[model samples]
Every structure is written in structure tokens, then in C-alpha cells.
Target: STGSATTTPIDSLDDAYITPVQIGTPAQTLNLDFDTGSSDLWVFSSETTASEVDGQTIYTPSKSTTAKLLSGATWSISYGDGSSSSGDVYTDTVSVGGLTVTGQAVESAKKVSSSFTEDSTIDGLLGLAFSTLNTVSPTQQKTFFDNAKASLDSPVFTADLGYHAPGTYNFGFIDTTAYTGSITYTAVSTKQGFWEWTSTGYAVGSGTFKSTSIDGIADTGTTLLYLPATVVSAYWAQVSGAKSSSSVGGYVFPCSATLPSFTFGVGSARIVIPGDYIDFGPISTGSSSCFGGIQSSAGIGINIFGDVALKAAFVVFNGATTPTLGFASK
Candidate 1:
């Protein structure tokens, strides 16, 4: 999803951002990463005072062969992470991987306060997450799909996302890299926005979720999965005489032996998140001493499914096509 390419500016195009795309008749690029978790698309702008894209490329309206500006409206964005940005509105003919997107909307983030803004190596963001958290406009008109939908090849937008450090994949196209054989589809639960569902509980080793009692949501925006402290401890108890390691921030257990395989269920859909996802590294940090598999969410919400749970599965956000989001293994 992150890459570079050249473009032929449209007649009225002044400037725009680029997206690596595989869809469209003559694929059209769109303005990207005017996000919620983030609050700006830090562009190189002449009016920029507080926001400086030191090393990243910026879009210049005047120097561009063609660009469009929204007359008098300005936008300010804020994130749940306490970051913020404000900028003027503009449109440009941007390109990516030899694809030209005409009249693509982009923001010239003049001020931003996120830690990501300090990272010079990071390019602009592509906010492909949900739009309910957006701040720029009414009706959330500027999502990546909203801008590129008109030119996209498929009526559907599917993401085969991974979790190799929030692993990413080719958008709109299903990646077949991890396919083993027949794929299983999990029905969508009509509970709330985003991919949410009701869960019975979690298990560790050969233990079963049916034996545990818990309920929660599966949210991608969430960084880590949360679970009841007791349930977390119960799940870890079965892992080969595993004693609860209180040194960890959450409920973690130190088991020198290989952890037992476990399965969890949501309705009738049962999923097994292998131990590999638990052990990013064996070293303990601070008071949190344990090998990662099942940890504690103690005082947090019941349970949440972040990227780790989604890694081995193909989660289909299908509100646009079907009322329910479907999950299937790659």
C-alpha cells in the first residue's frame, strides 16, 4: 500500500497525494491520509508555520501545473490519542504507480501535534479505517474509498490485512500467500459499527472457551485485546502448571515449555490464535514478566480483538455490500 510513482497532471490539477492502486479503468489517484487517529496530511506548504514536512515531499499549489482549492472553508482535525491538525482544503491531480487521479481531494496540514509528525522517515498516512471518527467534513466525504470508489474496478472493497507489526496487504485484492486449502466464512454479528461480535470467552493451551465465560467486541482500532482478569488467569492456568506472573502489566504466565493450543468462540465461529502471535519476544519488560500468550486486561473492558486476532483470518468489512462483516481464513 506504500509506494511511489509518476503522474501527468490534469488540466486543472494543482497538486494531490498518491495511492498505490490496482483498480480503475485508467486508475485514478485520490487524496489520502486525512485521518482521525492522526489529524493532518503534512504537506510541504508555503503558508506552513507550525507544520513542517522537513524531509517528506509537499504539494505546492502555485508551482503545480494544475490544482484546485475549496473556496473559503478550512478544516481542523483531532484524534482520540490527543493529537490535532488544521489546514486549508485543496484538490490536485495526483499519480501513483503510473496511475493518474484527477481532482483528488487533499489537505495541506499546516499544524499537527502527533508523535508521528516528529518521525521524518514516515510519509503521509492513508486513513483506510472507518470514517465515523473523521473530523474534516459533514457526511465523512473524504475516506480513501469515498474518493477512489468512482474509479475503482470492483463494487467491493476488501482488505486482506496482516499483523506483522500491524501487517498490511494489497487493498481491494485478496492475497493468497497464506492459503492452505478450503477457506471458512464466519457470519457477521449485527451488534455495532466496525467488525463487532459477541464472544463466549477465551482459552489457553488445550482449554476451551466454552468452559470460560466472557463477552466483548472485536475492534481494529484497539491496540491490544482485553479480557477479564479472572478469565485471563483461568486461561493461563491450564498451560502446563503455569503460575500467574504478576510482574507483567497484565495477566501473563512464564512457561518454559511450549504452550498448549487453544480455541475461542463467537456464536458458532471458533478461532484459534496460535501462540506465535503471543510471543513477539521472550524478554520481560518492567514488572511484566512472562512469555506472551494470554495476558490480563484486568481493569480494561471485557475483551477486544485487535490485529493479532485478525492476522490469520480475512476480515471482510462488508457494510457496503452485505449488512454483516464476514471473516474467513486466507
Candidate 2:
């Protein structure tokens, strides 16, 4: 039963990388976001109000022979940015990259917030977090990865993300061709249902590395790197004209301003995020002002190493004993 899958990124909306997933009999294929921050396999479906669905594709359970309604079951979730969804549950066969899980809990959305409804390209979310975070009512469900783990050569998956380019999500086995050098391993604490870790210290540009330990989570669903206010300020202070802008809701600087690379210590491995990666697109349409990718994690509660940071390295989501994280250069 050992197998693996390769998920390629979609061309548009560099905000998320989507992969094709087949659900139910006859295989109703849907493009899903593989979110490491959450733990529910939910999708836009026929139950969703038509007006709220817009241009996105919807899955129809009735059309699938293997779809079975999960009696008296329901699920809902609200994201950090206010995006939300709620719906009934169904037991179906779900497969990704030839790896199949029978009787998987599939949340079929009856209502979706504008944030999800407006995204025409993404049809669903494939949560990769621990099953403890599953949103199902009456009874909890295990994640696809968890269900498939026993059959895998190793309970591991790798997230190879790229900036505005195609990358892959590999399951079951690690491909040596995807990364270079030795992978630095770090212990992960999943008590809070997240891949939380601590960095010994960090440095702004070529500055001396501070011994200030920072606790954070690796979240693939999020787009930017968020740190403590103090850490955010330290990095911006190194830039000449950088300032926290209320209008932009983050620190903004001139597009031409050269930024120093940010480096974080994981055990003895130093993960260096290039200066150009810190410039997280423009602050406004047709504006020379750019928002810093590294911002304050004040209100967010948890420091997040989002796509901006994860894209800088090859990440291994190890679900084996100890649930460690392995990082290496891409």
C-alpha cells in the first residue's frame, strides 16, 4: 500500500497552491488548497447557496455512487481573516495522486463566506493539520494523511513551495532531487494542533543574531510572515524609510529601498530569508510603497511562518514518531 502523490501549483493567485483531489465514486475531481494550518477536508458543494458559489466548481454528492450522508453530522469553521464555511457531512472515497482513503469524512459546504466564494480557482481545502482540530460535530474524524500513514513507507510529506512558480507537495516519501544539502531537524509540539517550534534567535540583515527565542507555527494557509511586534520593529528599523502604516495595516517602505535578509536559528541551522522576499508585493495598486512581508503577530496570537518564509526552504511535515520538522535549501 505504499504510495505517494505530487501536487502542482495553479498558475494564477500566487496566494495559494492548489492540487487536484478525487472524491466519491467515478471520481469528482476538485482543486483543493492543502492547508497545513487547519484539519478539515471541506469543499464547495451542491448544498452551497448558488448565489454564494459564483464561478467556482461545486461537488455534488448525489451524483457520486460512493457518497453516503453522515447521519446527523455537521461542521463549520471561521478562519483568522473572518472567512468561514459551514455544511453537512458525507462519507466518501477520497483520493489524491493515486493514494486513496475509504470512507473519509467530507464536509460539503452549504454556506461559504465571500473570501472563499470569491476565489474562483480554489474549490476546497485539504487540511493537513492533526485530526484533533477537525471541526466535525457529534464525532471527530481523522485526516487523510493520518488514515493513509500506516500504508506509507514513512509517515512523512514534504512541502516544496516556490515564489510565483510551480512547486509540489510530496507524500509518503522524500525525493532527494527536490532539495540540496542536509535537512535540519527540529522537534515540534502539537499540543495546540499546530506545527509549533521555537527559533533560538534571529537577525536583521547582516546584524548580530539576537538570542531572543521566538515561538511560531509553520502555516501554509497564510501568505505572509508574522512575528512579534518587537521583532517586526527590529527588522524595519534597519531600513531607512520603513514605517508602520495604519492605512496599509502593516509596515511599508519604498520599493527601491534595499532590505537586509532575515535569518532565524533552528537548532544550529540558520534559515535565511532573502531581502527581496521581505518586500511582500505592493501596498496599493500602482503604488511604489510595498508592504513588509514580516509584520506584527500581536492580534494574530501566534507567530506564523507563512508562505513568504516557507517558500525559502524545503519543508518536511514528518508525522512519524515525535512529529519533527525537517528543513533544507531548495
Candidate 3:
């Protein structure tokens, strides 16, 4: 089977991207954040505290005839950003684009943090990471991609994200027209339950490419491009007024600062993120200083190639027994 879905940036700065997903019998559609860094398809539901749900579309399990309680099965998760959600589990029909999966484990949230409740752009998260990361216990369930891999024509999915524009996620096939040049493939280690890989090297603007192995996870749900302190420092140095500021909680600079383009290697190929892309937006309302899209990953433990880096290329997550990631310029 093959399918495609549209993802649009939530805000002007491209803070988050959301795609519509179909859940339950009557096909209740909800906007979801497709995350490759986590593995549990969770959503706000009727089970959630009424007061906790600010403006999200709730999934009422009782409304779907195909929905069945998992019976004592429960799941909970905490993110690197400190937001969390927990709830009971249910098996129901779930569909993405044109691909449908029956008996998919649809975790219904009974509680959510203020971060999740306050974000009205996304109703839930669709985890595309390996099922090993799923929080469900007493019999863990497969991820949506894992359950559908056998039926997929190529057992793969592609993430084609755009900067401040609509992008697409294609399953079962790669859209050659979405990218340019040949794709460079790399080995992926799911040992950590993430699409983790090592980049060959990096360069700042037209500067020489430095040979250094940078290992990181490809996290679509995250908003910034986080790397080692040294690499992040090098990039910011080129900007006239760039400086790491604790006041802004990250690397901040004058709104008028001139940032250089950042380029990272995928094997021998390079994916370049434009300077204006990293300019991001003002740090606060009507403020002259702006938060950078790229920042230090020291506090994050591991580097993360988040949405900022992702929107620069066409990324492929092959779901075969031997998983691999492919990158192509777009």
C-alpha cells in the first residue's frame, strides 16, 4: 500500500508541523505531530479530564464500534521538553492518508500537561519511531509504520518537510520529483529506539567542510537544530551580533544579525540550511532579539536534527528488518 499526507507549519517561524490523521469508525480526523523521536500513538480523548482539554479534538472510543479496550493496558510518556501525557489503551482502526491499519493501538489520554493543552495546533502525536520505544506494557504494541510495513510496497516512508510552507510525508515509495540529485544512504541504529545516525561532517557557509563524526537522532517533533557546543559555536561566530545568552534560554542575537548558512554531510552529500532560515524570529513579542533555530545540545544529552534541519532535505526512514536512512537534497 502507498499513501501521502500534507503537513503544514503551525506558526510563522515554523515552530511545529501538523498533519491530519483519521481515527475510529466514523473517521474522526485530528491534527497530529508526527514524531520520529518517540514511539506511541497517543491522543487527547473523552477519557481526558474535561478541564484539561483546552481546544483539542477529542477521540471518544465509545463512538467507534471497532474500538475495543485493551483491558488494563496503560501508557505514559515524558519528553525531553518536560511535557507529559498518560492514559488507557484501546485498539481501533487508524488511517493515514490512504493507508489503513486495523486494530492499531490508539492510546487515549486521560491527563495531559499544560504544554500539550495550550498547544491548539496539534491534537496528538503519531510516533514513527521503532516500537521498542513505545511505553505500553503487559504486551507492547507495534507502531503504525511497523504494523503497516509488511503491506507497504517498499517498507519505507519519506519525510519531505518545507520551511514555512506545506510539506508531505509519503509511505511505501519515494517521490523522486520531491528531491534533486542522487540519494545518499546511511545505516541507522534503533538500539536507542530512535532513528539515530552519524553524519560525516559539517561546514559553515562556504567554509571548508570539517571532518568530524556527529551522531544524532532525527526528531521531527522537535523545533530546533541542536548540535555539539563546538559546532554550534562555530556557526554563531559568523553572525555579527550572535551570542549564547542564558537570558533567552538559548543562543540569541540581534534581530538584524547576519547568520551564515549551515551545511551538514549525509555520507558524501551535503544538506545546507539557509542563513535566513536560522534567523528564526524575535525572541519575544515586539523584541529586537531573536532566538536562533540552531542551538547547543549540551543539555539535551544527544544532538537532535529537528525540524530546522529536516526541512532542508528529503529524509527516508526505511522500516525493513535492517533499518536505514536516506537523504536527498530538495
TM-score winner among the candidates?
3
On residues 41-117, what C-alpha lDDT tens digit does candidate 3 reach at each position? Answer: 99999999988899899999999989999999999999999999999999999999999999999999999999999
For candidate 2, the per-residue lDDT at 244 reads 94
Off by over 4 Å in 3: none
Error of 2 at 294 (Å): 0.8
| Clashing residue pairs in candidate 2 (N, C-alpha, C atoms within 3 angstroms) | none
Order by lDDT, highest first? 3, 2, 1
User: What's the best-to-worst order under TM-score?
Assistant: 3, 2, 1
CA lDDT scores, all candidates in order: 0.47, 0.87, 0.92
lDDT of 1 at 233: 64
Residue range 1-330, candidate 2, lDDT tens digits: 544454555543357788889998899999899889999999999999888997877889999999999999999998888899999999999988888889899999999999898888889999998999999998988888898898787899888887767778877988898888889999899999988888778989999989878898888888888999999999999998899988879899988899999988888887888988777667667888888888899999999988878888889999987898888887
TM-score: the better of candidates 1 and 2: 2
Alpha-carbon shift of residue 32 in model 3 (angstroms):
0.4
lDDT of candidate 1 over 219-326, digit per residue (tens): 543344456667666666665545654554444545355555556664456667766555434444453334554556655444665545655465544435543444
TM-score of each: 0.63, 0.95, 0.99
